Ligand binder design. Structure first.
Ligand code: HEM
Ligand SMILES: O=C1N[C@@H](Cc2ccc(O)cc2)C(=O)N[C@H]1Cc1ccc(O)cc1
Length: 394
């Protein structure tokens, strides 16, 4: 006799496990056990994933309630699970959104110059190069320092928190609180620094002294900086890293995008659709009894939305494992979520990858893995799937 299915199925981010297709066709909502020992519903078809994400009765903020079944332990204060709600209630949503657009002046040129500079340094050092630690992550870090308006030299200090902040742990993590309190204090100091006049933190620093915002807490202003740096850098760094693997594995596609770079936006959209960067389903707590497929989810139960369940669903994306640049529904994937909590940095994440890949194909058109693919070391118990090193030659 066996147990309930345990999630996650695999930490590998280069291929989807066969178990996902069997679950989707046979039991697209199914009971699973999480690493905390809690039970949850796993949803794995495009139709049911979209239903859950569009129904606000499946709540993200209630996942932080005491005594709720948990996917993993919180690494942030519980009020921060409601981060975007707190931002909107303070009247700051429009300000935050206009600061993280890729259309900000100098931003695209900064991204291009930084990507080229990183790749030139790698070419000078000679092969093998590590495209995660010496390209994808520094590019994500540099981009978010610029978007935030904070010194580039402070990027690596803030980055150091992320290997702990985004763990997917059964128990609370002592180091997460140490790093959180320290990073909050850094961002509080940025708000009092008169040299910080640009980017998101420059705008928040001005709004803090505006009478319309005098009753917004200093804690919220600092929290916006820490959370947007952290979520943005881990999400863009990890997506670009695993998109580069998908590209390297497909020399025909790599050659086509090198010859016709005007197809890079459509290629990136497919690379988003097939991306396995999210290591766990997205969690929601049922606030009511809700019918999902054949199952009545009860109030208080945990539901997990499996993004690669939806994004590889052949009923919505025929031939789902194939990158096809002429699909009729190309942005209808769930890589950025759906509904109330749709990613606010979607446009910035697209541009980061587009410019990173464009620069790579110009400088490194023969890029290939320097080791057999089974030699990549996949990070475990983490909210993203990423290889620890990505050694390439060219
Ligand atoms: C390719 C890059 C990215 C991917 C794949 C991605 C993916 C996602 C997904 C799937 C969600 C929904 C989570 C849920 O519903 O539980 C989300 C939300 C979020 N993302 Fe992104 N993201 C990316 C880039 C960014 C960037 C660049 C930023 C900020 C600079 C950012 C900040 C956020 C925030 C703050 C939320 C919470 C939204 C809310 O609760 O309403 N992300 N992201
Ligand atoms: O809990 C949150 N925390 C932050 C994201 C975050 C989590 C941990 C951390 O150290 C920094 C930011 C938020 O903006 N909203 C929510 C929901 C969330 C969680 C993870 C994620 O990848 C995206 C959204």
């Amino acid at each position: 006799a066996t147990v309930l299915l345990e999630v996650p199925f695999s930490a590998r981010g280069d291929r989807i496990p066969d178990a996902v297709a069997e679950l989707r066709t046979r039991e697209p909502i199914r009971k699973v056990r999480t690493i905390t020992g809690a039970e949850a519903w796993l949803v794995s078809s495009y139709a049911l994933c979209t239903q859950v994400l569009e129904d606000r009765r499946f709540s993200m903020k209630e996942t932080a309630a005491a005594g709720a079944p948990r996917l993993n332990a919180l690494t942030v204060p519980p009020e921060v699970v409601n981060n975007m709600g707190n931002i909107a209630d303070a009247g700051l949503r429009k300000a935050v959104m206009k600061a993280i657009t890729p259309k900000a002046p100098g931003l695209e040129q900064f991204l291009r110059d930084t990507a080229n500079s990183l790749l030139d340094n790698l070419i000078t050092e000679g092969a093998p190069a590590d495209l995660r630690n010496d390209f994808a992550d520094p590019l994500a870090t540099a981009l978010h320092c610029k978007v935030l308006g904070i010194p580039q030299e402070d990027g690596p200090k803030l980055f150091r928190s992320l290997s702990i902040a985004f763990m997917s742990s059964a128990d609370p993590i002592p180091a997460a609180k140490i790093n959180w309190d320290r990073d909050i204090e850094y961002m509080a100091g940025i708000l009092e620094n008169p040299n910080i006049t640009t980017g998101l933190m420059g705008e928040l620093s001005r709004l803090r002294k505006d009478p319309a915002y005098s009753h917004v807490s200093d804690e919220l202003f600092a929290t916006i900086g820490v959370t947007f740096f952290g979520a943005g850098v881990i999400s863009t760094g990890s997506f670009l890293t695993t998109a580069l693997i998908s590209l390297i594995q497909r020399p025909q596609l790599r050659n086509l995008l090198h010859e016709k770079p005007e197809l890079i936006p459509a290629g990136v959209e497919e690379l988003l659709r097939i991306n396995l960067s999210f290591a766990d389903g997205l969690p929601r707590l049922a606030t009511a009894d809700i019918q999902v497929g054949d199952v009545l989810v009860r109030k208080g139960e945990l539901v997990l939305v499996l993004l690669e369940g939806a994004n590889f669903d052949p009923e919505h994306f025929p031939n789902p494992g194939s990158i096809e640049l002429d699909r009729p529904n190309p942005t209808s994937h769930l890589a950025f979520g759906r509904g109330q909590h749709f990613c606010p940095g979607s446009a910035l994440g697209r541009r980061h990858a587009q410019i990173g890949i464009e620069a790579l194909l110009k400088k490194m058109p023969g890029v290939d893995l320097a080791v057999p693919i089974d030699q990549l070391v996949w990070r475990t118990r983490f909210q993203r799937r990423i290889p620890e090193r990505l050694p390439v030659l060219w």
